[PDB]
Each structure stands twice: as C-alpha cells, then as structure tokens.
UniProtKB/Swiss-Prot annotation, chains A, B:
GO molecular-function terms, A-Z: amyloid-beta binding; apolipoprotein A-I receptor binding; apolipoprotein receptor binding; chemorepellent activity; cholesterol binding; cholesterol transfer activity; enzyme binding; heat shock protein binding
Keyword match Cytoplasm: no
Protein family per UniProt: Belongs to the apolipoprotein A1/A4/E family.
Sugar attachment sites: 196
Record gene name: APOA1
Protein name (database record): Apolipoprotein A-I
Organism: Homo sapiens
Amino acid sequence: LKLLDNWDSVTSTFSKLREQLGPVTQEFWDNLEKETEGLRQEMSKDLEEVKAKVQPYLDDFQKKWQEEMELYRQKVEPLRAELQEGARQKLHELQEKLSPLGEEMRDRARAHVDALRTHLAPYSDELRQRLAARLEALKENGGARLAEYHAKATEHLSTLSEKAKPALEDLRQGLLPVLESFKVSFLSALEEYTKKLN
Amino acid sequence: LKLLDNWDSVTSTFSKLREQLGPVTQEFWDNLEKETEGLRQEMSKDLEEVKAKVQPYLDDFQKKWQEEMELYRQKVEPLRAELQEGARQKLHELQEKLSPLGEEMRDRARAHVDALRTHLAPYSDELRQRLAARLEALKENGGARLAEYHAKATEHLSTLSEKAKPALEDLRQGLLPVLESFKVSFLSALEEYTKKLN
Ligand SMILES: CCCCCCCC/C=C\CCCCCCCC(=O)OC[C@H](COP(=O)(O)OCC[N+](C)(C)C)OC(=O)CCCCCCC/C=C\CCCCCCCC
Ligand SMILES: CCCCCCCC/C=C\CCCCCCCC(=O)OC[C@H](COP(=O)(O)OCC[N+](C)(C)C)OC(=O)CCCCCCC/C=C\CCCCCCCC
Ligand SMILES: CCCCCCCC/C=C\CCCCCCCC(=O)OC[C@H](COP(=O)(O)OCC[N+](C)(C)C)OC(=O)CCCCCCC/C=C\CCCCCCCC
Ligand SMILES: CCCCCCCC/C=C\CCCCCCCC(=O)OC[C@H](COP(=O)(O)OCC[N+](C)(C)C)OC(=O)CCCCCCC/C=C\CCCCCCCC
Ligand SMILES: CCCCCCCC/C=C\CCCCCCCC(=O)OC[C@H](COP(=O)(O)OCC[N+](C)(C)C)OC(=O)CCCCCCC/C=C\CCCCCCCC
Ligand SMILES: CCCCCCCC/C=C\CCCCCCCC(=O)OC[C@H](COP(=O)(O)OCC[N+](C)(C)C)OC(=O)CCCCCCC/C=C\CCCCCCCC
Ligand SMILES: CCCCCCCC/C=C\CCCCCCCC(=O)OC[C@H](COP(=O)(O)OCC[N+](C)(C)C)OC(=O)CCCCCCC/C=C\CCCCCCCC
Ligand SMILES: CCCCCCCC/C=C\CCCCCCCC(=O)OC[C@H](COP(=O)(O)OCC[N+](C)(C)C)OC(=O)CCCCCCC/C=C\CCCCCCCC
Ligand SMILES: CCCCCCCC/C=C\CCCCCCCC(=O)OC[C@H](COP(=O)(O)OCC[N+](C)(C)C)OC(=O)CCCCCCC/C=C\CCCCCCCC
Ligand SMILES: CCCCCCCC/C=C\CCCCCCCC(=O)OC[C@H](COP(=O)(O)OC[C@H](N)C(=O)O)OC(=O)CCCCCCC/C=C\CCCCCCCC
Ligand SMILES: CCCCCCCC/C=C\CCCCCCCC(=O)OC[C@H](COP(=O)(O)OC[C@H](N)C(=O)O)OC(=O)CCCCCCC/C=C\CCCCCCCC
C-alpha cells in the first residue's frame, strides 16, 4: 500500500538521477575530451620518442646481446670441453668405483640376503609355530567368547524386549494425549497466527 | 513427567546392563587371562628365539658391517684421493678459466653497463622532459578535472539534499506508520507465541 507512495519517491529519485545523467554526463565527456586532448599530445610525443629511443636502445642492447652471446659462446665452448673432460673423468672416476664397489655391494647383498634367508626362514617358521599357538588361543577364547557373546546377547535381547514392550506401549499410550494436546496447541496457534497473516 | 518416566526406562536398562557388565568383565578377564597365559609362554619362546638368536644374527651382520665399513674406508682413502686429484685438475682448470672469463666479463661490462650509463643518462634526462609534458597535461587536465568534478560534485550534492531532506521526510512518513503497524503485529505475535508452550 504505502509501497506505491515510496516507489513514487523512487520515481523522483530516478528523475533526479536522470537530471545528473544530463549536464554532468555531458560534462564528463567534455572532461574526457580534455583528457584525451592532453593524452593525444602525450601519446604522440610518447610513441614518437619511444620509437626514436627504442631503435638505439634495442640496437645497442642487441650489441650487448651479441657481446654476451658471442662472449658466452666463447666461454661455453672451452668450458664444455673442460666440463666434458671433467665429466668423463668423473664418469671414469665413478665407474672405476662402481665396479669394485658394485662387486662389493653385490657380495654384501649376497652375504646379507643369504643371511636373511637363513635368518628369516627360521624366524618365519618360529612365527608360524607362535602364530599357531596364538591362533589356538584365539580359538580357545574365541569359541568361549562366541558362547558368551551369544548368551549375553540373549540376555541383552531379553532386557531389550522387556524394555521395548512397556516402553512402546507407554510411548504410544502417552503419544495419544501428547499428539492430541499438540494438535490442540497447534490448532490454536495456527488459528492465531493466521490472524496475523491476514 | 515425560523426562522422568522415560529416564526410569533408561535407568532400568543401565542397572540391568551393569548386571550383565559384571559377568562380562569377569569372563572377559578370564579370557584375557587365558590370552595372556598363552602369550606369556609365547613371549617366553618368542623373546627367547628372538634375543638368543638375535646374537648370532647381529654377530653375523656385524662381521659383514665391519668388513663393509673397513672395505668402504679402504676404498674411501684412494677414492677420495682420486676425487681430490681429479677435482684439483678440474678446479685448477676452472681457476685458469675464471681468470680470463672474469676479466673479459669485466671488460664486456665496460661495453655493457658502462655503455648503458651513457645511454640511460640521456634517456632518463629526456624522460624528465617527457614527464614534464605528461605532468603539464596532467596539470591542465588535472586542474580541469578538479574544476569539472567539483562542479559536478556540487550538482550531486544539491540533488543529493533533495533526496536527503524531502526523501527522508517521505521515509519518515513511512517508518513512523510502518513501525506503528509492525509494533501492533509484533506485540500480538510475541504475545501469542507465549500462549502455547510456556
Ligand atoms: C622503449 C619502450 C619502453 C616502454 C614500453 C614498455 C611497456 C610494456 C608494454 C605494454 C604494457 C601492457 C599494459 C596494457 C594492457 C593490455 C590490455 C589489452 O589490450 O589486453 C588484451 C590482450 C590480448 O592478447 P593478444 O592476443 O593481443 O596478445 C598476444 C599477442 N599476439 C597476438 C600478438 C602475438 O590481453 C593480454 O595481453 C593478456 C592475456 C590474458 C591472459 C589471462 C590468463 C592469465 C593466467 C594466469 C595469471 C598469472 C599471474 C602470474 C603473475 C605472478 C604472480 C605471483
Ligand atoms: C656438468 C658436466 C656435464 C655432464 C651432464 C650429464 C647429463 C646426463 C645426460 C642425459 C641423460 C640421459 C637421459 C635418460 C632419460 C631416461 C628417463 C627414464 O625413463 O628413466 C627411467 C629408466 C628406467 O630404468 P630401466 O633400466 O628399467 O629402463 C631402461 C629404459 N631405457 C631404454 C630408456 C634405457 O632409467 C633409465 O633408462 C636409466 C637411468 C638411470 C641411469 C643410471 C646410470 C648412472 C650413471 C652413473 C652413476 C652416477 C651417480 C651420480 C649421482 C650421485 C647422487 C648421490
Ligand atoms: C549406553 C552405553 C554408555 C556407556 C556406559 C555404560 C553404562 C553406565 C554404567 C556405569 C557408569 C558409572 C559412572 C562412571 C563415572 C563417570 C565420571 C564422569 O563424570 O564422567 C564424565 C566425564 C565427562 O568429561 P568432563 O566434562 O567431566 O571433563 C572435562 C575435563 N576438564 C574439566 C578437565 C576439562 O568423562 C570422564 O570422566 C571420562 C569417561 C568416564 C566414563 C566411564 C564409563 C565406562 C563404561 C563402559 C565401558 C566398559 C569398559 C569395560 C570393558 C573392559 C575392557 C578391557
Ligand atoms: C586388548 C588390549 C587393550 C587396549 C585396546 C587398544 C588396542 C591397542 C593395544 C595395546 C596398547 C595398550 C594401550 C593402553 C594405554 C592406556 C592409555 C590411556 O588410556 O591412558 C590414560 C590412563 C588414565 O589416567 P590419566 O590419563 O587420567 O592420568 C594421566 C594424566 N594425564 C593425562 C592427565 C596428564 O592412564 C593410564 O592408564 C596410565 C598407564 C598407561 C599404561 C601404558 C603402557 C601400556 C603397555 C602395554 C599394554 C598391554 C596390553 C596387553 C594386553 C593383552 C591383550 C591380549
Ligand atoms: C618378527 C619379530 C618377532 C617379535 C619380536 C619382539 C621384538 C620387538 C622389537 C624391538 C623392540 C623395540 C622397542 C624399544 C623401546 C625403546 C626405544 C627407545 O629407546 O626410545 C627412546 C628414543 C630416544 O630418542 P630421543 O630423541 O628422545 O633421544 C635423543 C638421544 N640421542 C642422542 C641419544 C640418540 O626414541 C627413539 O629411538 C625413537 C625416535 C625415532 C622415531 C621417529 C618418529 C617419526 C615419525 C613418524 C614416522 C612415520 C612413518 C610413516 C609410515 C607411512 C608409510 C606409508
Ligand atoms: C646490466 C643490466 C642493467 C641492470 C643495472 C645494473 C645493476 C647491477 C649492479 C650491481 C650488482 C647487484 C645486483 C645483484 C642482486 C642483489 C643481491 C643483494 O641484494 O646483495 C646484497 C645482500 C645483502 O643482504 P644483507 O646480509 O646485508 O641483509 C640482511 C638483512 N636485511 C635483508 C634485512 C637487510 O647479499 C649480500 O650482500 C651477499 C652476496 C649476494 C650477492 C648476489 C649477487 C649475485 C650476482 C648476480 C646475479 C646472478 C646472475 C646469474 C646469471 C648467470 C649467467 C651465467
Ligand atoms: C632476458 C631478460 C630481459 C631483461 C632485460 C634487462 C634490462 C635492464 C633495464 C633497465 C635497468 C636500468 C636501472 C637503472 C640503474 C639505477 C637503479 C637505482 O636507482 O639504483 C639505486 C637504488 C637505491 O637503493 P635504495 O636506497 O632505494 O635501496 C635500499 C636497499 N637496501 C635495503 C638493501 C639497503 O637501488 C635499488 O633500487 C636497488 C635495491 C632495492 C632492491 C630492489 C629489488 C631487487 C631485486 C633483485 C636483485 C636485482 C638488482 C638489480 C638492480 C635493480 C635496480 C632497480
Ligand atoms: C556517474 C554519474 C552517476 C551519479 C553518481 C552520484 C553519486 C554522488 C557523487 C559524488 C558526491 C560524494 C563525493 C565525496 C566523497 C568523499 C571523498 C573524500 O573526501 O575521500 C577521502 C576521505 C578521507 O578519509 P581518510 O581515509 O583519509 O580518513 C580515515 C580516518 N582515520 C585516519 C582518520 C581515522 O574518505 C572518506 O570520507 C570516506 C568515505 C567512504 C564513502 C564510500 C561510498 C561510496 C559510494 C558509492 C560507491 C558505489 C560502487 C557501486 C558498485 C559498482 C560495481 C561496478
Ligand atoms: C516454533 C517457534 C519456537 C518458539 C520459541 C521462541 C524463539 C526462540 C528464539 C531464539 C533463541 C534465543 C536467542 C535470541 C536472544 C537474543 C540475543 C540478542 O539479540 O542479544 C542482544 C545482543 C546485543 O549486543 P549486547 O547487548 O550483547 O552487547 C552490548 C555491547 N556493548 C557493551 C558494547 C554495549 O545481540 C548480540 O550481541 C548479537 C546480535 C544479534 C542480531 C540481532 C538483530 C539486530 C538487527 C539488525 C542488524 C542486522 C542483523 C542481520 C543478520 C541477520 C539476522 C536474521
Ligand atoms: C499460519 C501457518 C504458519 C505455518 C508455517 C509453516 C512453515 C512453512 C515453511 C516453508 C514452506 C515453503 C517451502 C518452499 C520450498 C521451495 C521448493 C522449490 O524450490 O520449488 C521450486 C520453485 C520454482 O519456481 P519457478 O517455478 O517460477 O520455476 C522456474 C525455476 N526457477 C527454473 O529455473 O526453472 O521455487 C519456488 O518455491 C517458487 C515458486 C512459488 C510459487 C507460489 C505459489 C503460491 C502459493 C501460495 C499462495 C497462497 C495465497 C493465496 C492468496 C493470494 C492473494 C492474491
Ligand atoms: C529506505 C531504507 C533506508 C535504510 C536505513 C538503515 C538505517 C539503520 C540504522 C542504524 C544502523 C546502525 C549502524 C551502526 C554503525 C557503527 C559502526 C561502529 O563503528 O561500530 C562500533 C563497533 C565497536 O567499536 P569499538 O571501538 O568499541 O570496538 C570495541 C573495542 N575494540 C573492544 O575490544 O572492546 O565496531 C565494530 O565492532 C564493527 C561494526 C561495523 C558495522 C557494520 C557497518 C556496515 C556498513 C555498510 C555495509 C555496505 C552495504 C552496502 C549495501 C548496498 C546494496 C544495496
């Protein structure tokens, strides 16, 4: 209802906004023209000077790159030779170590793995006997616990049924007046709330 | 009474649960006793075949570990010498390489950085003229911007007050009646809320 009056004010607001979108926006364009006018001079001088300076800058930089690339080439070429000779030497040095140390490592592995064979074989076998006893214990206690679990489950089931029987009946018996009182409560509330929505 | 009678149903469950928990803990303990009994004899054998047999295990591994370390050290001495000798050659080669490389790098820098000095100087100096041109435009357009924006600001403020005073009165003429109505609705709603479950 009052929303119509308030929206009318919004209409005045829109009108007042449009008034600003007139002279102000036009002046904004004029201002932008001023900006672009100055920027035209700036851009012109900038572009022209950039192109004029970019030439000696890039060309002289290219010279730097030449001295650097050619210089580095004349550095990497001999360095590569030395590095390759040093690397091949390193490879030889390493290879002359990898052979004896390899033989050693292989023999070490033999003496270790073979030892492990004769150390883990009895170990696992011992574990088999131990795990057998462990399993047997788990069976002895397991079979017993199975009976215990079943027995206690029966007792707990009985304690559940002896509870469920009266609990369900009492819950239902109480749910009757409860649901009805709740119904009445809601019926009254809903009837009062509708008066607020009307 | 709901939370009272229902609680009794839980209490009777807890009490009878304890009646089962009693034997449960005893039987669990009994089974745990048998479990620990087996594990006791087990640990007696386990730790025995583990410790008494770990001696020959470690004694075996120690022999190998000793020879491994000894052979390793026996290799380390000449191998380190080889590496050091090779590294000495490589390092010495690098020493005689870093000398011309560094010297030429320094000389190249005389045609790099030094040449850039005579380039960056005029460029930055000219940049000062460019900055002046830009600054002048930014001063002209800036001063205009300030003027234009100020003029627009005043027009914004004048139209703003038209939407700050008459519009606020319109809002006040809405807030007041609306608050009265809302209060009536709230007064009844809050009152009806406590008229069902309290
Ligand atoms: C002497 C002279 C000195 C002074 C001059 C030097 C000044 C430097 C030069 C220029 C200034 C650039 C500023 C203007 C902005 C450009 C706006 C524009 O015109 O824009 C459109 C372009 C379109 O692309 P194009 O096809 O024309 O260009 C590809 C080129 N081709 C066709 C030509 C070969 O858009 C692009 O250039 C942008 C591409 C959009 C890609 C978005 C995906 C980004 C992904 C990940 C974000 C990574 C963040 C990483 C940073 C690290 C943070 C820790
Ligand atoms: C600064 C001076 C300059 C010196 C620069 C040297 C740069 C080296 C340059 C190029 C490397 C070659 C590229 C290798 C790319 C393979 C990637 C890959 O797919 O790779 C996994 C495979 C799997 O193996 P595979 O046998 O099943 O496959 C055999 C398969 N097929 C057919 C490829 C042989 O690997 C392979 O192929 C083999 C990879 C393993 C290589 C083992 C030999 C190592 C040599 C010496 C010992 C050095 C120890 C030094 C490090 C010490 C650290 C403390
Ligand atoms: C429906 C099934 C539910 C389970 C219950 C079984 C049935 C009921 C039977 C007996 C209950 C008797 C009363 C137990 C004593 C209660 C002590 C207590 O006040 O407790 C509540 C506290 C709560 O923390 P707070 O906020 O006070 O502390 C905050 C700490 N501040 C201040 C430092 C930051 O909790 C504590 O104290 C820590 C926990 C103490 C509760 C122990 C109950 C154990 C029951 C069954 C497990 C059976 C094990 C037997 C099997 C053997 C296996 C080898
Ligand atoms: C079926 C096996 C039952 C366990 C079930 C889980 C399976 C994982 C298996 C074995 C690990 C055993 C874990 C027992 C450790 C108890 C941890 C615990 O709950 O710690 C709290 C209690 C209560 O005191 P508090 O925190 O208030 O006081 C200290 C004060 N503070 C907190 C405030 C600053 O502290 C104490 O109990 C203090 C003494 C803790 C004893 C640590 C040494 C345990 C060593 C061996 C356990 C042997 C199991 C063998 C059974 C064979 C089964 C076949
Ligand atoms: C089949 C065989 C049959 C069964 C036979 C039964 C035999 C059982 C076998 C062995 C018995 C072991 C029990 C020993 C108990 C005491 C250990 C101990 O003496 O304990 C204390 C130490 C102290 O150390 P401290 O710094 O205090 O002393 C600084 C001291 N300084 C200078 C001297 C060295 O502590 C340490 O030795 C612990 C420090 C190292 C722990 C680092 C933890 C790192 C964190 C996470 C690991 C994550 C792995 C992720 C896996 C994912 C895979 C996907
Ligand atoms: C030609 C192109 C035109 C560009 C203009 C020319 C400018 C070049 C002029 C001079 C060289 C300086 C530039 C190098 C980078 C700066 C490193 C730096 O900031 O250094 C000083 C810092 C001092 O820290 P603080 O301990 O006093 O502060 C601790 C406490 N706080 C941080 C709170 C104050 O460190 C030290 O003095 C410790 C030593 C670290 C030295 C690093 C220099 C490395 C050299 C070159 C870069 C890598 C090139 C690699 C390419 C390879 C090609 C083969
Ligand atoms: C293929 C790839 C293509 C790339 C092409 C390369 C073209 C190069 C083009 C143009 C370069 C012209 C540079 C003009 C030379 C003068 C620079 C300048 O005016 O130099 C003096 C300033 C003043 O020192 P301050 O008192 O302000 O600092 C206090 C520092 N405190 C806290 C450590 C004590 O020093 C500074 O601005 C520097 C100290 C502040 C640290 C800034 C971050 C540096 C980062 C990495 C290391 C690089 C250093 C390179 C030199 C950069 C210069 C901008
Ligand atoms: C295009 C034509 C359409 C029509 C437009 C009509 C709009 C009306 C236009 C202009 C008239 C109002 C302009 C005057 C504004 C003030 C500017 C100013 O004097 O500023 C600086 C002050 C200084 O405070 P300080 O920080 O130094 O002191 C911190 C204090 N300590 C240190 C002391 C404790 O700051 C302040 O007064 C802080 C004020 C913050 C006010 C923010 C409100 C902005 C309004 C709208 C933005 C809408 C964005 C819409 C989303 C679009 C997404 C595409
Ligand atoms: C079937 C139906 C069932 C029937 C049952 C009945 C309904 C039961 C309903 C709710 C459960 C109880 C909770 C409500 C109790 C009121 C809490 C409250 O309100 O206590 C007031 C405090 C105010 O501050 P203070 O006096 O404690 O501090 C003093 C600071 N000194 C010292 C600087 C001066 O409140 C605060 O602290 C926090 C502010 C909370 C915001 C309140 C709204 C404010 C209005 C506009 C601001 C916009 C909020 C926008 C967020 C969206 C909300 C939908
Ligand atoms: C006092 C009692 C108090 C008890 C309070 C209990 C609490 C209840 C709380 C919540 C219940 C509401 C639960 C709402 C669950 C929302 C379920 C949902 O997402 O439904 C889908 C619709 C979708 O609408 P859209 O159909 O227009 O479809 C396009 C869609 N978005 C698309 O992209 O394709 O979205 C919509 O609901 C919008 C369409 C609405 C149609 C209007 C239908 C009109 C419905 C009712 C009008 C009755 C008034 C008649 C008198 C009018 C007078 C003129
Ligand atoms: C026609 C309809 C007209 C609508 C009219 C509405 C009018 C409503 C009337 C009154 C509103 C009341 C407005 C009250 C504003 C007061 C803001 C303020 O400074 O509050 C003070 C507090 C506390 O400061 P203290 O210095 O006391 O800090 C406590 C101290 N450090 C301590 O440890 O004890 O600061 C804080 O804790 C932070 C609070 C920040 C507030 C968030 C402010 C959020 C602001 C803006 C959000 C941007 C939203 C833009 C939405 C646009 C889309 C449409």
